[PDB]
């Protein structure tokens, strides 16, 4: 029935910058809500909006829904790592039959990238603690400007940038993992299909 158009679907903002998600509808909504679902957890209410045109703010968060009662936005200031997750806007279904229920949007998945001040990009080879025959490649210490892409080799596995542990950001660094079972696999040409910093350290086992 009622539908909530939430945009944009994804947002990859870096640490410290601002966040902005919009939410539009074709029907009116007397109450607008915002939820934040952290990874592996459930959605928790972020802010409730009961008055039209009221700019409400709880420090880092700011939200409002217009007088037309069809739009709403949410702003997060000074992005910190724990802000990663899915963000839903909700509106209480107008009427009494559909009351208690609320229509949600598709949600925006937010990712916060670390600010690497001293980059030292390099590609290392790590040996397995059991079979020294097997190994992995470790691209690390690259800043957030570098984007890691998958490999054209079907028998080569490529891991994108990992989400850091929100509990402690000590040793905050970007990293990517590559490994394969092909005998023609060498770490020097594992990330050949990605744009890599020119001054990237390529040591040898």
């Amino acid at each position: 029935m009622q539908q909530l158009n939430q945009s944009p679907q994804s947002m990859f903002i870096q640490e410290g910058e601002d966040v902005s998600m919009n939410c539009t509808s074709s029907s009116i909504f007397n109450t607008w809500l915002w939820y934040k679902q952290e990874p592996g957890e459930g959605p928790v209410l972020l802010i409730a909006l009961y008055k039209a045109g009221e700019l409400t703010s709880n420090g880092r968060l700011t939200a409002q829904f217009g007088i037309t009662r069809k739009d709403s936005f949410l702003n997060i200031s000074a992005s910190i790592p724990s802000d990663v997750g899915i963000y839903f806007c909700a509106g209480q279904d107008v009427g009494n039959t559909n009351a208690g229920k609320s229509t949600f949007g598709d949600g925006t998945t937010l990712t916060v990238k670390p600010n690497i001040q001293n980059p030292d990009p390099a590609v290392y080879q790590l040996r397995d603690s059991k079979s020294s025959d097997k190994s992995v490649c470790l691209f690390t210490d690259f800043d957030s400007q570098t984007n890691v892409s998958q490999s054209k080799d079907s028998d080569v596995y490529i891991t994108d940038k990992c989400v850091l542990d929100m509990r402690s950001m000590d040793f905050k660094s970007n990293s990517a993992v590559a490994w394969s079972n092909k005998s023609d696999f060498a770490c020097a040409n594992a990330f050949n299909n990605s744009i890599i910093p020119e001054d990237t350290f390529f040591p040898s086992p």
Binding site: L33, V44, G100, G107, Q125, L126, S129, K130, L138, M169
Partner: protein, 238 residues
């Protein structure tokens, strides 16, 4: 609070599954959602005790609200289309809803594809230790299906949360294949002097959610049960 049982579950096509939801606030309204990678979709919602009304996608599901504190969701004949992350909700005075921790349900045509993960820890390279004065351990879990895995780092019995970077989403080993096995990567970065100590014990745990004790196995390999596969490594000084 709201609780959901079970948290992880694997079932087959045509089987009867029940997801449980509990709440201690005595809230009158309760909800059951499914979150398919279409947003949150309402399956059923209960206004009060013995009051159950359909939602946006009620086909294939049945609920009941005999008591206030419980809202069980039942899959009558499980289908592959019912594979989702199921979220229960409750609300006292509308509109604010309170959600449970969620249930990750996977329906399969057969249990011959469920596999436990093979976990391996890869020791840091001396080049990194000589270059950055740091030591990155990489944990690799491969060949598991489905993706009901939880990765954690264990160092000398305590939990490492500093310098830990785990993959957000698993990696389909054969992305073109249907019901393909997955792979998960993770990293743990310590100081060079911390790795050079040989008494420090590094262990990467991967909690896999597989088959329960009430399932059977007619095949030869060990029945892929809910288990923990772990890999260890000790810090060489050279």
């Amino acid at each position: 609070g709201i609780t959901q049982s079970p948290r992880y579950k694997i079932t087959e096509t045509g089987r009867q599954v029940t997801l449980m939801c509990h709440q201690t606030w005595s809230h009158s309204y309760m909800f059951w959602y499914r979150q398919d990678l279409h947003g949150l979709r309402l399956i059923y919602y209960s206004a009060a005790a013995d009051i159950t009304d359909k939602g946006e996608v009620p086909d294939g599901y049945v609920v009941s609200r005999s008591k206030t504190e419980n809202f069980p969701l039942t899959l009558e004949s499980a289908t592959r289309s019912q594979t989702s992350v199921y979220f229960c909700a409750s609300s006292g005075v509308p509109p604010v809803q309170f959600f449970g921790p969620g249930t990750r349900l996977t329906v399969l045509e057969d249990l011959n594809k469920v596999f436990p993960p093979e976990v391996a820890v890869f020791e840091p390279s001396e080049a990194e230790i000589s270059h950055t004065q740091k030591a990155t351990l990489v944990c690799l879990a491969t060949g598991f299906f489905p993706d009901h895995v939880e990765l954690s780092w264990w160092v000398n019995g305590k939990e490492v949360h500093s310098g830990v970077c785990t993959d957000p989403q698993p990696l389909k080993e054969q992305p073109a294949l249907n019901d393909s096995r997955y792979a998960l990567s993770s990293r743990l970065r310590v100081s060079a002097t911390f790795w050079q100590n040989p008494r420090n014990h590094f262990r990467c745990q991967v909690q896999f959610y597989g088959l329960s004790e009430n399932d059977e196995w007619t095949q030869d390999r060990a029945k892929p049960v809910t288990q923990i596969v772990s890999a260890e490594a000790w810090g060489r000084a050279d």
